[PDB]
């Protein structure tokens, strides 16, 4: 499957087995002037947010984790 992956945002073939695209956001030390960080990649299981303001969005179609 294909998902948008960071750092350089492009569609990439997921490592086989991984069929879930994800979007992960969190707050940096620069969040006041730049906003939330955002990570994009593949996964075999939708990640579980550690704690705090980490929110994770998952889907299961090609290139569904578009950049906000």
């Amino acid at each position: 499957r294909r998902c948008f992956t960071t750092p350089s945002v492009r569609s990439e073939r997921c490592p086989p087995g991984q069929e879930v695209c994800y979007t992960k956001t969190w707050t940096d030390g620069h969040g006041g002037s730049r906003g939330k960080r955002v990570d994009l990649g593949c996964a075999a299981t939708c990640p579980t947010p550690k704690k705090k303001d980490i929110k994770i969005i998952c889907c299961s179609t090609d290139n569904c984790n578009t950049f906000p």
Partner: antibody
Framework: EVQLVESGGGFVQPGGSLRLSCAAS????????MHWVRQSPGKGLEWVSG???????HYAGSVKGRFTISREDAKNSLDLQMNNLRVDDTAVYFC????????????????????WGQGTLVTVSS | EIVLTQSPSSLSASVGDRVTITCQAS??????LNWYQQKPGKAPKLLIY???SLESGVPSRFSGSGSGTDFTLTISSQQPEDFATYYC?????????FGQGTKVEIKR
């Protein structure tokens, strides 16, 4: 996993030259700021030069005019042509990737140095 | 050229001790300061960027503080794999500059 590999180091006499190259695993140079950082017991870690994502080159003062950093687009080769070398240039040279962090406001480059090659040894001696 | 002054250049610590490393910049650099860890024979590893933000995979015992000129790296509980040399690095203006390093050694 993402890696950087250096090549072209060795032993050279004062006034000599050396062409270091860097090859990346898992990413493309033109999307990132790339840097060369050297390390020696005596001056520590020292940023030598950088070639940002848009194609502009930058150099440290002790090296400007003698070193040339360049990129072979789509060829996976970042080079540092070091000319008129000095004993003072003896160091381990690291190929270093400038970080690329994405925010809801866009992309930001070189907040830090996240990928470091294994290093190549350069020794200038008579 | 921004000068970074790391203190101490060396320090001894036991497992479980609280380690404190400081870094002082010769001028204001906001929070554009990073911390690296380096083992002998190896390349430095990025640990903290933006003074306080950890990289992925870095244990929670590492933490950073400061903005302006005075910065701190703290290891809440020294572990065996933490005996290394630690460098601060500013990303405020050209040229990028590093501190002289703090070598954490085994106390006995």
């Amino acid at each position: 996993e993402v890696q950087l590999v250096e090549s072209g180091g060795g032993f050279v006499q004062p006034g000599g030259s050396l062409r270091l190259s860097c090859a990346a695993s898992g990413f493309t140079f033109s999307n990132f700021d790339m840097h060369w950082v050297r390390q020696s017991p005596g001056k520590g870690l020292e940023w030598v030069s950088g070639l940002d994502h848009s194609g502009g080159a930058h150099y440290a003062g002790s090296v400007k005019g003698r070193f040339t950093i360049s990129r072979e687009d789509a060829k996976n080769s970042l080079d540092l042509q070091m000319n008129n070398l000095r004993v003072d240039d003896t160091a381990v040279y690291f190929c270093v990737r400038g970080t690329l962090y994405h925010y809801t406001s866009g992309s930001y480059y070189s907040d830090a140095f996240d990928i470091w090659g294994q290093g190549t040894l350069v020794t200038v001696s008579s | 050229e921004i000068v970074l002054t790391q203190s101490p250049s060396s320090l001894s610590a036991s497992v479980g001790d609280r380690v404190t490393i400081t870094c002082q910049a010769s001028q204001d650099i906001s929070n554009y300061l990073n911390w690296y860890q380096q083992k002998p024979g190896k390349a430095p590893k990025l640990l903290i960027y933006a003074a306080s933000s950890l990289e992925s995979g870095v244990p929670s015992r590492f933490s950073g503080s400061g903005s302006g000129t005075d910065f701190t790296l703290t290891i809440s509980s020294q572990q065996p794999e933490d005996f290394a040399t630690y460098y601060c690095q500013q990303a405020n203006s050209f040229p990028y500059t590093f501190g002289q390093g703090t070598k954490v050694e085994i106390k006995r």
